Amino acid sequence: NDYCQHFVDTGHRPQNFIRDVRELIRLKDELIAKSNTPPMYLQADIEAFDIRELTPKFDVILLEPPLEEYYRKCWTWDDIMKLEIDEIAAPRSFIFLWCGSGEGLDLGRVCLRKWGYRRCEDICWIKTNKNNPLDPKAVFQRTKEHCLMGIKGTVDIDLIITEEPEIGNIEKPVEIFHIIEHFCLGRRRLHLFGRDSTIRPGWLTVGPTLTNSNYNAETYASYFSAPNSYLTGCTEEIE
């Protein structure tokens, strides 16, 4: 049966009909939770903020700038591409960049290359409209957002399926955190443009709308001092 035809007929998106979205994996989740640094967070206007102050250099950066298309301060790709991300990324490190569904899919690739990464995955957040069955250049109704994964230096699927959030809700699916943490990429994890509602153990959140801060550069670095410098975030703590 043709779900594209069904959507034009009824308004129910094709992804509404995907179902069901070795034994346990939970021990891995347990090891992740054990090695998680305390949550740390800092209110900072990132336009004006000298990002160099964020140390040490990060193993993972999750970058979630507030694009104009998420509505109806917004950040243009002009703004984002001028961020000096390569100054705070570790020589081997990873980036997850929320690119939206428009020109961000192109300009975000330019950013990744600007900061020294190559794209190795395209993670698609597909939004169902089970509960509620328009860019001028758009050819199609846009029902998904892309999060690009980049690498620099030397169990999960690449789809996230959730219901489309209410209008004006900009949150991204918390599942992106699970995908990232299951990669076991190291423990210095930065989330730029996070919010009070996204603060999470194992992560440093930095964004303009945070209401409180507890970031201390020296305290933060002490979580990764020897013998804890190279842990993947997926192994036992060091006794």
Partner: protein, 200 residues
Amino acid sequence: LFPPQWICCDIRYLDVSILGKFAVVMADPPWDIHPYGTLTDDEMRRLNIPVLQDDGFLFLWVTGRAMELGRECLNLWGYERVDEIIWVKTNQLQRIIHWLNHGKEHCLVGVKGNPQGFNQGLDCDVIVAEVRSTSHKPDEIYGMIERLSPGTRKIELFGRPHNVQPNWITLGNQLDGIHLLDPDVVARFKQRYPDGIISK
């Protein structure tokens, strides 16, 4: 001309100027990603895609590094990427089939010129559909393209015999011979290729 048409050929060498202009182009190229005969990056850049349309849409399947190279060709050939379709691959029970497992295939959507009279916005950019033989795109894409631009002329590059469709001219080197019905195309084909051979 409404019924299916095709040309077995090496798309590198066919003079595609005999084919006229098309409202929609679709291509599923044999990108040189690291099974079949491949095309170098330069060969893809050099494909004479620009003569095929004046105002319309290009559908460009991509995977791996061709997600980037496909964007380069798309722009070189004179298009702006305005959409990106994903096909979520399921089984018959509607369940999903490097660093992550791959649940989907990507089709870039480019626009050239200013297409008028298309039905933009009728379909959405996610296709959910059952997988078949390796290397087959889902048939839903032809329905989406028909609704977008009903009755117009369309051309597929690097298609196979199962891809021949009404309103479409299919090119690929595994098609059975040459089967043309449109008189202007039949005429220009005879001039350019009087002994029916397509070399160099």
